[PDB]
Protein backbone atom coordinates (compact mmCIF):
# COMPACT_ATOMS: atom_id res chain seq x y z
CA UNK A 1 0.00 0.00 0.00
CA UNK A 2 0.94 3.74 -0.09
CA UNK A 3 2.97 4.26 3.18
CA UNK A 4 4.19 7.72 4.27
CA UNK A 5 6.87 9.21 6.57
CA UNK A 6 5.81 12.70 7.80
CA UNK A 7 7.45 15.18 10.20
CA UNK A 8 5.33 18.04 11.72
CA UNK A 9 7.27 21.15 13.04
CA UNK A 10 5.49 23.88 15.11
CA UNK A 11 7.15 27.04 16.55
CA UNK A 12 5.20 29.60 18.68
CA UNK A 13 6.66 32.94 19.75
CA UNK A 14 5.69 34.07 23.25
CA UNK A 15 6.51 37.81 23.57
CA UNK A 16 7.73 38.63 27.09
CA UNK A 17 7.93 34.92 28.15
CA UNK A 18 11.31 34.27 26.49
CA UNK A 19 12.24 32.66 23.16
CA UNK A 20 9.93 30.62 20.91
CA UNK A 21 8.99 27.02 21.71
CA UNK A 22 9.73 24.32 19.08
CA UNK A 23 7.69 21.06 18.90
CA UNK A 24 8.33 18.25 16.38
CA UNK A 25 6.59 14.87 15.88
CA UNK A 26 7.16 12.19 13.22
CA UNK A 27 4.62 9.65 11.92
CA UNK A 28 4.69 6.56 9.67
CA UNK A 29 1.13 6.38 8.24
CA UNK A 30 -1.21 7.03 11.23
CA UNK A 31 1.44 6.03 13.86
CA UNK A 32 3.45 8.59 15.88
CA UNK A 33 7.03 7.28 16.48
CA UNK A 34 9.04 10.39 17.68
CA UNK A 35 8.59 13.72 19.52
CA UNK A 36 10.86 16.66 20.52
CA UNK A 37 10.09 19.74 22.68
CA UNK A 38 12.59 22.66 22.96
CA UNK A 39 11.16 23.46 26.49
CA UNK A 40 12.23 19.96 27.78
CA UNK A 41 15.27 20.17 30.13
CA UNK A 42 18.21 18.83 27.99
CA UNK A 43 15.75 18.31 25.10
CA UNK A 44 16.09 15.08 23.02
CA UNK A 45 14.29 13.14 20.26
CA UNK A 46 12.13 10.65 22.28
CA UNK A 47 10.68 7.40 20.82
CA UNK A 48 6.84 7.10 21.04
CA UNK A 49 6.30 3.73 19.28
CA UNK A 50 7.65 0.34 20.52
CA UNK A 51 9.62 -0.42 17.28
CA UNK A 52 11.89 2.75 17.23
CA UNK A 53 13.49 1.92 20.65
CA UNK A 54 15.42 -0.73 18.56
CA UNK A 55 17.76 1.88 16.94
CA UNK A 56 21.18 2.76 18.52
CA UNK A 57 21.50 5.82 20.85
CA UNK A 58 23.24 7.56 17.85
CA UNK A 59 19.88 7.38 15.91
CA UNK A 60 18.30 9.59 18.66
CA UNK A 61 21.57 11.66 18.84
CA UNK A 62 21.15 12.40 15.10
CA UNK A 63 17.44 13.33 15.31
CA UNK A 64 18.27 15.49 18.44
CA UNK A 65 20.93 17.49 16.47
CA UNK A 66 18.47 18.08 13.56
CA UNK A 67 15.53 19.12 15.87
CA UNK A 68 17.89 21.60 17.70
CA UNK A 69 18.84 23.02 14.26
CA UNK A 70 15.13 23.30 13.25
CA UNK A 71 14.43 24.99 16.66
CA UNK A 72 17.19 27.62 16.04
CA UNK A 73 16.26 28.30 12.34
CA UNK A 74 12.55 28.85 13.33
CA UNK A 75 13.64 31.43 16.04
CA UNK A 76 14.99 33.56 13.14
CA UNK A 77 12.03 32.68 10.90
CA UNK A 78 9.50 34.02 13.44
CA UNK A 79 11.65 37.25 13.62
CA UNK A 80 12.03 37.72 9.80
CA UNK A 81 8.27 36.90 9.23
CA UNK A 82 7.26 39.59 11.78
CA UNK A 83 9.45 41.93 9.61
CA UNK A 84 7.90 40.70 6.28
CA UNK A 85 4.36 41.45 7.58
CA UNK A 86 5.55 44.64 9.44
CA UNK A 87 3.92 43.24 12.65
CA UNK A 88 4.63 44.64 16.19
CA UNK A 89 6.54 42.59 18.84
CA UNK A 90 3.53 42.02 21.15
CA UNK A 91 1.43 39.32 19.31
CA UNK A 92 2.27 35.59 19.34
CA UNK A 93 2.77 34.02 15.89
CA UNK A 94 3.13 30.48 14.55
CA UNK A 95 5.31 28.77 11.93
CA UNK A 96 4.40 25.22 10.85
CA UNK A 97 6.30 22.90 8.47
CA UNK A 98 5.12 19.50 7.22
CA UNK A 99 7.60 17.45 5.13
CA UNK A 100 8.10 13.80 4.22
CA UNK A 101 7.65 11.26 1.41
CA UNK A 102 5.02 8.78 0.11
CA UNK A 103 6.19 5.33 -1.02
CA UNK A 104 4.01 3.63 -3.61
CA UNK A 105 3.82 -0.24 -3.89
CA UNK A 106 6.86 -0.30 -6.32
CA UNK A 107 8.87 0.64 -3.19
CA UNK A 108 10.27 3.80 -4.79
CA UNK A 109 9.43 7.47 -4.10
CA UNK A 110 5.85 8.24 -5.24
CA UNK A 111 5.75 11.85 -3.95
CA UNK A 112 7.83 14.30 -1.84
CA UNK A 113 6.36 17.10 0.38
CA UNK A 114 7.82 20.20 2.07
CA UNK A 115 5.31 22.97 2.92
CA UNK A 116 5.06 25.90 5.37
CA UNK A 117 2.23 27.95 7.00
CA UNK A 118 2.44 31.29 8.95
CA UNK A 119 -0.35 31.79 11.57
CA UNK A 120 -2.07 28.71 10.01
CA UNK A 121 -2.26 30.08 6.41
CA UNK A 122 -0.33 28.68 3.37
CA UNK A 123 3.09 30.43 3.10
CA UNK A 124 5.38 28.42 0.73
CA UNK A 125 5.41 24.85 -0.66
CA UNK A 126 7.85 22.80 -2.72
CA UNK A 127 5.98 21.80 -5.95
CA UNK A 128 5.94 18.02 -6.82
CA UNK A 129 8.80 18.58 -9.43
CA UNK A 130 11.02 19.26 -6.31
CA UNK A 131 12.59 22.33 -8.09
CA UNK A 132 10.05 25.26 -7.91
CA UNK A 133 8.10 26.80 -4.96
CA UNK A 134 4.47 28.11 -4.77
CA UNK A 135 4.40 31.29 -2.58
CA UNK A 136 0.96 32.16 -1.07
CA UNK A 137 1.59 35.98 -0.90
CA UNK A 138 4.06 38.91 -1.39
CA UNK A 139 5.99 38.08 1.85
CA UNK A 140 6.46 34.41 0.76
CA UNK A 141 7.61 35.69 -2.70
CA UNK A 142 10.68 37.22 -0.93
CA UNK A 143 11.35 33.72 0.55
CA UNK A 144 10.79 32.11 -2.93
CA UNK A 145 13.35 34.42 -4.71
CA UNK A 146 15.94 33.89 -1.85
CA UNK A 147 15.51 30.01 -1.80
CA UNK A 148 15.56 29.85 -5.65
CA UNK A 149 18.69 32.17 -5.79
CA UNK A 150 20.45 29.87 -3.21
CA UNK A 151 19.28 26.54 -4.79
CA UNK A 152 17.78 25.32 -1.39
CA UNK A 153 15.37 22.87 -3.21
CA UNK A 154 18.36 20.59 -4.17
CA UNK A 155 18.96 19.95 -0.43
CA UNK A 156 15.31 18.84 0.08
CA UNK A 157 15.62 16.88 -3.23
CA UNK A 158 18.73 15.15 -1.81
CA UNK A 159 17.05 14.32 1.58
CA UNK A 160 13.87 13.13 -0.23
CA UNK A 161 15.21 10.77 -2.99
CA UNK A 162 17.87 9.61 -0.41
CA UNK A 163 17.26 9.45 3.41
CA UNK A 164 13.42 9.81 3.51
CA UNK A 165 12.58 6.73 1.30
CA UNK A 166 15.46 4.75 3.02
CA UNK A 167 14.26 5.39 6.63
CA UNK A 168 10.57 4.87 5.68
CA UNK A 169 11.54 1.31 4.48
CA UNK A 170 13.62 0.72 7.71
CA UNK A 171 10.60 1.78 9.92
CA UNK A 172 8.07 -0.33 7.91
CA UNK A 173 10.37 -3.41 8.40
CA UNK A 174 11.17 -2.83 12.15
CA UNK A 175 7.40 -2.17 12.69
CA UNK A 176 6.00 -4.91 10.32
CA UNK A 177 3.70 -6.51 13.00
CA UNK A 178 2.08 -3.07 13.73
CA UNK A 179 2.41 -0.83 10.60
CA UNK A 180 1.85 -3.49 7.83
CA UNK A 181 -0.91 -5.36 9.84
CA UNK A 182 -4.33 -3.66 9.31
CA UNK A 183 -6.74 -4.18 12.29
CA UNK A 184 -10.35 -4.54 10.99
CA UNK A 185 -13.21 -2.58 12.64
CA UNK A 186 -15.52 -4.46 15.03
CA UNK A 187 -18.94 -3.14 13.87
CA UNK A 188 -22.23 -3.18 15.83
CA UNK A 189 -25.56 -1.23 15.59
CA UNK A 190 -27.19 0.40 18.65
CA UNK A 191 -30.85 1.54 18.94
CA UNK A 192 -31.70 4.79 20.84
CA UNK A 193 -35.46 5.61 20.96
CA UNK A 194 -36.02 9.44 20.60
CA UNK A 195 -39.86 9.89 20.10
CA UNK A 196 -43.02 8.31 18.51
CA UNK A 197 -41.71 9.34 15.03
CA UNK A 198 -37.94 8.69 15.49
CA UNK A 199 -35.53 5.90 16.54
CA UNK A 200 -31.75 6.61 16.16
CA UNK A 201 -29.90 3.68 14.50
CA UNK A 202 -26.16 4.19 15.32
CA UNK A 203 -23.55 2.15 13.41
CA UNK A 204 -20.20 1.90 15.30
CA UNK A 205 -16.72 1.07 13.91
CA UNK A 206 -14.26 0.36 16.75
CA UNK A 207 -10.67 -0.86 17.11
CA UNK A 208 -9.55 -0.26 13.47
CA UNK A 209 -6.09 0.69 12.08
CA UNK A 210 -5.28 2.52 9.88
CA UNK A 211 -7.66 5.53 10.32
CA UNK A 212 -9.13 5.52 6.77
CA UNK A 213 -12.69 4.00 6.67
CA UNK A 214 -16.07 4.41 4.92
CA UNK A 215 -19.19 4.09 7.13
CA UNK A 216 -22.56 4.53 5.30
CA UNK A 217 -26.24 3.84 5.87
CA UNK A 218 -28.57 2.61 3.09
CA UNK A 219 -32.40 2.59 3.20
CA UNK A 220 -33.55 -0.24 0.78
CA UNK A 221 -30.32 0.12 -1.36
CA UNK A 222 -30.48 4.01 -1.26
CA UNK A 223 -27.45 5.91 0.24
CA UNK A 224 -28.43 8.18 3.23
CA UNK A 225 -25.16 10.31 3.30
CA UNK A 226 -27.11 13.63 2.84
CA UNK A 227 -29.38 12.89 5.86
CA UNK A 228 -27.10 10.99 8.34
CA UNK A 229 -24.97 12.14 11.31
CA UNK A 230 -21.27 11.16 10.77
CA UNK A 231 -18.61 11.97 13.44
CA UNK A 232 -14.95 12.72 12.61
CA UNK A 233 -12.70 9.60 12.99
CA UNK A 234 -11.25 9.72 16.57
CA UNK A 235 -8.31 8.02 18.36
CA UNK A 236 -9.32 5.24 20.82
CA UNK A 237 -6.09 6.11 22.75
CA UNK A 238 -4.59 2.57 22.27
CA UNK A 239 -3.33 3.25 18.69
CA UNK A 240 -6.72 2.25 17.08
CA UNK A 241 -9.53 4.55 15.78
CA UNK A 242 -13.32 4.97 16.19
CA UNK A 243 -16.17 6.33 14.05
CA UNK A 244 -19.96 6.17 13.97
CA UNK A 245 -22.76 7.07 11.53
CA UNK A 246 -26.40 7.45 12.67
CA UNK A 247 -29.85 7.92 11.04
CA UNK A 248 -33.26 8.87 12.48
CA UNK A 249 -35.74 6.17 11.28
CA UNK A 250 -39.49 5.76 12.06
CA UNK A 251 -39.97 2.91 14.62
CA UNK A 252 -40.84 -0.45 12.88
CA UNK A 253 -38.79 0.68 9.79
CA UNK A 254 -35.46 -0.49 11.39
CA UNK A 255 -35.03 -3.54 9.01
CA UNK A 256 -35.10 -1.22 5.89
CA UNK A 257 -31.64 0.15 7.04
CA UNK A 258 -28.22 -1.46 6.32
CA UNK A 259 -24.90 -0.05 7.57
CA UNK A 260 -21.88 -0.51 5.27
CA UNK A 261 -18.27 -0.74 6.50
CA UNK A 262 -15.23 -0.75 4.15
CA UNK A 263 -11.62 -0.93 5.55
CA UNK A 264 -8.38 -2.40 4.08
CA UNK A 265 -8.45 -4.85 7.07
CA UNK A 266 -11.72 -6.52 5.88
CA UNK A 267 -11.48 -9.36 3.30
CA UNK A 268 -15.16 -8.44 2.50
CA UNK A 269 -17.15 -5.22 3.17
CA UNK A 270 -19.38 -5.64 6.28
CA UNK A 271 -23.18 -5.29 5.88
CA UNK A 272 -25.10 -5.24 9.21
CA UNK A 273 -28.43 -3.98 10.66
CA UNK A 274 -30.29 -3.62 14.02
CA UNK A 275 -30.08 -6.99 15.98
Amino acid sequence: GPHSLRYFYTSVSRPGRGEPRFLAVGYVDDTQFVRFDSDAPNPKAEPRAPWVEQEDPEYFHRSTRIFKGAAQIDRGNLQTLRGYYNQSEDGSHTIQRMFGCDLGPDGRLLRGYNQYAYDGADYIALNEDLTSWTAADMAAQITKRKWEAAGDAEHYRSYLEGLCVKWLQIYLDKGKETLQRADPPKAHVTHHPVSAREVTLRCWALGFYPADISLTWQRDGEDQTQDMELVETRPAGDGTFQKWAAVGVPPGEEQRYTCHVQHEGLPEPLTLKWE
Binding site: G76, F99, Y116, Y123, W167
Partner: peptide, 9 residues
Amino acid sequence: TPQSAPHGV
Protein backbone atom coordinates in the same frame (compact mmCIF):
# COMPACT_ATOMS: atom_id res chain seq x y z
CA THR B 1 15.06 10.57 10.21
CA PRO B 2 14.19 14.31 9.96
CA GLN B 3 15.83 17.25 8.04
CA SER B 4 16.27 21.03 8.79
CA ALA B 5 16.05 23.69 6.00
CA PRO B 6 19.49 25.03 4.90
CA HIS B 7 18.25 28.67 5.32
CA GLY B 8 15.53 30.75 7.07
CA VAL B 9 12.59 32.24 5.08
